[PDB]
Motif scaffolding. Structure first.
Motif, PDB file in Angstrom:
ATOM      1  N   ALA A  83       0.852  -1.201   0.000  1.00  0.00           N
ATOM      2  CA  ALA A  83       0.000   0.000   0.000  1.00  0.00           C
ATOM      3  C   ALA A  83       0.871   1.229   0.000  1.00  0.00           C
ATOM      4  CB  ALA A  83      -0.903   0.028   1.230  1.00  0.00           C
ATOM      5  N   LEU A  84       0.339   2.302  -0.550  1.00  0.00           N
ATOM      6  CA  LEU A  84       1.043   3.577  -0.697  1.00  0.00           C
ATOM      7  C   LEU A  84       0.826   4.494   0.497  1.00  0.00           C
ATOM      8  CD1 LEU A  84       2.430   5.380  -2.996  1.00  0.00           C
ATOM      9  CD2 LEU A  84       0.066   6.096  -3.606  1.00  0.00           C
ATOM     10  N   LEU A  85       1.891   5.027   1.119  1.00  0.00           N
ATOM     11  CA  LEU A  85       1.711   5.974   2.223  1.00  0.00           C
ATOM     12  C   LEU A  85       1.314   7.294   1.531  1.00  0.00           C
ATOM     13  CD1 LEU A  85       4.673   5.104   4.556  1.00  0.00           C
ATOM     14  CD2 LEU A  85       2.343   4.164   4.525  1.00  0.00           C
ATOM     15  N   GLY A  95      -1.610  13.033   1.063  1.00  0.00           N
ATOM     16  CA  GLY A  95      -2.655  13.782   0.333  1.00  0.00           C
ATOM     17  C   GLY A  95      -4.025  13.086   0.480  1.00  0.00           C
ATOM     18  N   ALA A  96      -4.092  11.862   0.977  1.00  0.00           N
ATOM     19  CA  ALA A  96      -5.388  11.214   1.148  1.00  0.00           C
ATOM     20  C   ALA A  96      -5.826  11.383   2.601  1.00  0.00           C
ATOM     21  CB  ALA A  96      -5.353   9.703   0.897  1.00  0.00           C
ATOM     22  N   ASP A  97      -7.081  11.812   2.780  1.00  0.00           N
ATOM     23  CA  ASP A  97      -7.643  11.959   4.144  1.00  0.00           C
ATOM     24  C   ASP A  97      -8.007  10.583   4.685  1.00  0.00           C
ATOM     25  OD1 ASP A  97      -7.797  14.818   3.712  1.00  0.00           O
ATOM     26  OD2 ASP A  97      -9.861  14.645   3.159  1.00  0.00           O
ATOM     27  N   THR A 145     -10.317   1.068  -5.999  1.00  0.00           N
ATOM     28  CA  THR A 145      -9.209   2.017  -6.127  1.00  0.00           C
ATOM     29  C   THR A 145      -8.143   1.415  -7.046  1.00  0.00           C
ATOM     30  OG1 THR A 145      -7.568   3.248  -4.907  1.00  0.00           O
ATOM     31  CG2 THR A 145      -8.234   1.024  -3.945  1.00  0.00           C
ATOM     32  N   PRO A 146      -7.496   2.224  -7.888  1.00  0.00           N
ATOM     33  CA  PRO A 146      -6.354   1.747  -8.675  1.00  0.00           C
ATOM     34  C   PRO A 146      -5.268   1.157  -7.822  1.00  0.00           C
ATOM     35  CG  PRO A 146      -7.117   3.822  -9.522  1.00  0.00           C
ATOM     36  CD  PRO A 146      -7.755   3.668  -8.133  1.00  0.00           C
ATOM     37  N   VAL A 147      -5.008   1.649  -6.587  1.00  0.00           N
ATOM     38  CA  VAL A 147      -3.895   1.143  -5.718  1.00  0.00           C
ATOM     39  C   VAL A 147      -4.321   1.251  -4.268  1.00  0.00           C
ATOM     40  CG1 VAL A 147      -2.969   3.478  -5.700  1.00  0.00           C
ATOM     41  CG2 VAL A 147      -1.419   1.658  -5.103  1.00  0.00           C
ATOM     42  N   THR A 168       2.719  12.795  -0.806  1.00  0.00           N
ATOM     43  CA  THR A 168       3.607  11.691  -1.136  1.00  0.00           C
ATOM     44  C   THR A 168       2.927  10.706  -2.083  1.00  0.00           C
ATOM     45  OG1 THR A 168       2.818  10.549   0.848  1.00  0.00           O
ATOM     46  CG2 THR A 168       4.808  11.988   1.035  1.00  0.00           C
ATOM     47  N   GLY A 169       1.590  10.772  -2.189  1.00  0.00           N
ATOM     48  CA  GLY A 169       0.793   9.845  -3.050  1.00  0.00           C
ATOM     49  C   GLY A 169       0.756  10.288  -4.533  1.00  0.00           C
ATOM     50  N   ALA A 170       1.044  11.577  -4.750  1.00  0.00           N
ATOM     51  CA  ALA A 170       1.073  12.153  -6.091  1.00  0.00           C
ATOM     52  C   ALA A 170       2.462  12.005  -6.701  1.00  0.00           C
ATOM     53  CB  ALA A 170       0.743  13.651  -6.047  1.00  0.00           C
ATOM     54  N   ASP A 171       2.547  11.397  -7.867  1.00  0.00           N
ATOM     55  CA  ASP A 171       3.819  11.280  -8.558  1.00  0.00           C
ATOM     56  C   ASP A 171       4.179  12.593  -9.194  1.00  0.00           C
ATOM     57  OD1 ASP A 171       3.813   8.423  -8.236  1.00  0.00           O
ATOM     58  OD2 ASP A 171       2.872   8.232 -10.156  1.00  0.00           O
ATOM     59  N   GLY A 212      -4.587  10.451 -14.191  1.00  0.00           N
ATOM     60  CA  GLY A 212      -5.673   9.792 -13.472  1.00  0.00           C
ATOM     61  C   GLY A 212      -5.468   9.793 -11.983  1.00  0.00           C
ATOM     62  N   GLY A 213      -6.558   9.935 -11.297  1.00  0.00           N
ATOM     63  CA  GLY A 213      -6.575   9.929  -9.852  1.00  0.00           C
ATOM     64  C   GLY A 213      -7.631   8.898  -9.482  1.00  0.00           C
ATOM     65  N   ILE A 214      -8.118   8.945  -8.266  1.00  0.00           N
ATOM     66  CA  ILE A 214      -9.163   7.982  -7.808  1.00  0.00           C
ATOM     67  C   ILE A 214     -10.369   7.843  -8.735  1.00  0.00           C
ATOM     68  CG2 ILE A 214     -11.127   8.388  -6.025  1.00  0.00           C
ATOM     69  CD1 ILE A 214      -9.400   6.186  -5.007  1.00  0.00           C
TER      70      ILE A 214
HETATM   71  C1  LIG Z   1      -8.192   9.172  -1.687  1.00  0.00           C
HETATM   72  C2  LIG Z   1      -8.476  10.557  -1.176  1.00  0.00           C
HETATM   73  C3  LIG Z   1      -9.262  10.710  -0.031  1.00  0.00           C
HETATM   74  O1  LIG Z   1      -9.673   9.575   0.619  1.00  0.00           O
HETATM   75  C4  LIG Z   1      -9.553  11.968   0.516  1.00  0.00           C
HETATM   76  C5  LIG Z   1      -9.013  13.112  -0.044  1.00  0.00           C
HETATM   77  C6  LIG Z   1      -8.220  12.980  -1.179  1.00  0.00           C
HETATM   78  C7  LIG Z   1      -7.933  11.717  -1.745  1.00  0.00           C
HETATM   79  C8  LIG Z   1      -7.074  11.629  -2.905  1.00  0.00           C
HETATM   80  O2  LIG Z   1      -7.401  11.003  -3.923  1.00  0.00           O
HETATM   81  N1  LIG Z   1      -5.921  12.323  -2.831  1.00  0.00           N
HETATM   82  C9  LIG Z   1      -5.021  12.315  -3.975  1.00  0.00           C
HETATM   83  C10 LIG Z   1      -4.618  13.746  -4.177  1.00  0.00           C
HETATM   84  S1  LIG Z   1      -5.864  14.592  -5.170  1.00  0.00           S
HETATM   85  C11 LIG Z   1      -6.831  15.454  -4.035  1.00  0.00           C
HETATM   86  C12 LIG Z   1      -8.053  15.921  -4.500  1.00  0.00           C
HETATM   87  C13 LIG Z   1      -8.843  16.643  -3.625  1.00  0.00           C
HETATM   88  C14 LIG Z   1      -8.408  16.883  -2.318  1.00  0.00           C
HETATM   89  C15 LIG Z   1      -7.178  16.402  -1.858  1.00  0.00           C
HETATM   90  C16 LIG Z   1      -6.385  15.672  -2.740  1.00  0.00           C
HETATM   91  C17 LIG Z   1      -3.905  11.348  -3.569  1.00  0.00           C
HETATM   92  O3  LIG Z   1      -3.131  11.905  -2.499  1.00  0.00           O
HETATM   93  C18 LIG Z   1      -2.875  11.044  -4.667  1.00  0.00           C
HETATM   94  N2  LIG Z   1      -3.452  10.049  -5.578  1.00  0.00           N
HETATM   95  C19 LIG Z   1      -3.049   8.751  -4.988  1.00  0.00           C
HETATM   96  C20 LIG Z   1      -3.722   7.587  -5.748  1.00  0.00           C
HETATM   97  C21 LIG Z   1      -5.254   7.694  -5.713  1.00  0.00           C
HETATM   98  C22 LIG Z   1      -5.752   6.437  -6.495  1.00  0.00           C
HETATM   99  C23 LIG Z   1      -5.273   6.501  -7.953  1.00  0.00           C
HETATM  100  C24 LIG Z   1      -3.756   6.455  -8.019  1.00  0.00           C
HETATM  101  C25 LIG Z   1      -3.178   7.602  -7.210  1.00  0.00           C
HETATM  102  C26 LIG Z   1      -3.477   8.987  -7.822  1.00  0.00           C
HETATM  103  C27 LIG Z   1      -2.902  10.138  -6.948  1.00  0.00           C
HETATM  104  C28 LIG Z   1      -3.320  11.437  -7.580  1.00  0.00           C
HETATM  105  O4  LIG Z   1      -4.469  11.887  -7.399  1.00  0.00           O
HETATM  106  N3  LIG Z   1      -2.328  11.916  -8.374  1.00  0.00           N
HETATM  107  C29 LIG Z   1      -2.388  13.184  -9.139  1.00  0.00           C
HETATM  108  C30 LIG Z   1      -1.004  13.346  -9.830  1.00  0.00           C
HETATM  109  C31 LIG Z   1      -3.580  13.102 -10.141  1.00  0.00           C
HETATM  110  C32 LIG Z   1      -2.615  14.377  -8.228  1.00  0.00           C
END
Ligand SMILES: Cc1c(O)cccc1C(=O)N[C@@H](CSc1ccccc1)[C@H](O)CN1C[C@H]2CCCC[C@H]2C[C@H]1C(=O)NC(C)(C)C
Lengths: 99, 99
Positions: free
Chosen positions: A22-24, A27-29, A80-82, B26-29, B48-50
């Motif tokens: 799993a990914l630390l 940015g995810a709540d 979720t993708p990961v 740290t989750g964002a590349d 792509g994100g979630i």
């Molecule tokens: C999973 C989640 C929650 O449970 C609650 C709040 C946010 C998130 C969430 O998805 N946060 C994301 C930041 S994008 C973001 C958008 C709005 C607010 C805060 C962060 C993740 O930290 C990073 N997130 C981790 C992970 C999520 C599943 C898909 C693969 C990566 C995609 C990556 C991501 O989105 N990367 C970008 C380069 C598109 C920014």
């Protein structure tokens, strides 16, 4: 441990008796894992991130081990993708960002 | 500094003389910033994100200062809710996850 970020911060976790990677993610709540069957009643929930919202199953008070540290909190299970460990469990294991 | 995760790790960044708030992720590349007109050509890109993918404009060699620390690298600009500083920039400022 002190984890640098040249590579994705993936770690092994143990949940429901299974090991998973799993990914630390600071940015995810929330903590969101791939589809899997956990014991316990669960509640439907919706969470969003870039790209939009996804439907997940919310399990409360789940025991999870992250690099041996125990945490007991809410875990969302869905498509979720990961596998992601968010701030709700990172705080429990005492994780901080440092520079 | 040491940033705890009780709250979202938002910090002040400066880019092109403008101060902005951004999430250390740290989750964002990649680094993704809210829509803004940067000079320079850019390449279209889909990330792509979630919940799916979004279209963004990629700009290269952009300088960003994160809590007094300079970083220079690619930034994606698109209709994001929050500025996200990803690993490509976090590594440059020597940011580590510690527990
Ligand atoms: C999973 C989640 C929650 O449970 C609650 C709040 C946010 C998130 C969430 O998805 N946060 C994301 C930041 S994008 C973001 C958008 C709005 C607010 C805060 C962060 C993740 O930290 C990073 N997130 C981790 C992970 C999520 C599943 C898909 C693969 C990566 C995609 C990556 C991501 O989105 N990367 C970008 C380069 C598109 C920014």
């Amino acid at each position: 441990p002190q984890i640098t970020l040249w590579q994705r911060p993936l770690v092994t976790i143990k949940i429901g008796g299974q090991l998973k990677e799993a990914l630390l993610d600071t940015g995810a709540d929330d903590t969101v894992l791939e589809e899997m069957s956990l014991p316990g009643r669960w509640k439907p929930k919706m969470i969003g991130g870039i790209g939009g919202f996804i439907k997940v199953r919310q399990y409360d008070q789940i025991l999870i081990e992250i690099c041996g540290h125990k945490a007991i909190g809410t875990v969302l299970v869905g498509p979720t993708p990961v596998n992601i460990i968010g701030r709700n469990l990172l705080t429990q294991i005492g994780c901080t960002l440092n520079f």
